[PDB]
């Protein structure tokens, strides 16, 4: 966590429907965006911290 990794997602078509539908994720909390509506929103830039 002190050295959290960061990936940049770009030049691709994202599909968040799979992530939302997956039940494995224990806690999915979206601030500023609806997880259900994620399927449509475009993004000029995406960061994936892990």
């Amino acid at each position: 966590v002190y050295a959290w990794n960061r990936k940049r997602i770009s030049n691709c078509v994202a599909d968040y429907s799979v992530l939302y539908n997956s039940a494995s994720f224990s806690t999915f909390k979206c601030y500023g965006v609806s997880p259900t509506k994620l399927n449509d929103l475009c993004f000029t830039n995406v960061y994936a911290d892990s």
Partner: protein
């Protein structure tokens, strides 16, 4: 010479412009564009915005 009249023709216009400009303010919402709020957030959460 036509100051008075001209001033009136200005003031009303000014108000209108300011009024239109108010559409772009956020008022604490996440986005001043209503359609953006509707799209990003679901109706329940988006209700507050």
């Amino acid at each position: 010479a036509l100051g008075k009249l001209q001033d009136v023709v200005n003031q009303n216009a000014q108000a209108l412009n300011t009024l239109v400009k108010q559409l772009s303010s956020n008022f604490g919402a996440i986005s001043s564009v209503l359609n953006d709020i509707l799209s990003r957030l679901d109706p329940p959460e988006a209700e507050v915005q």
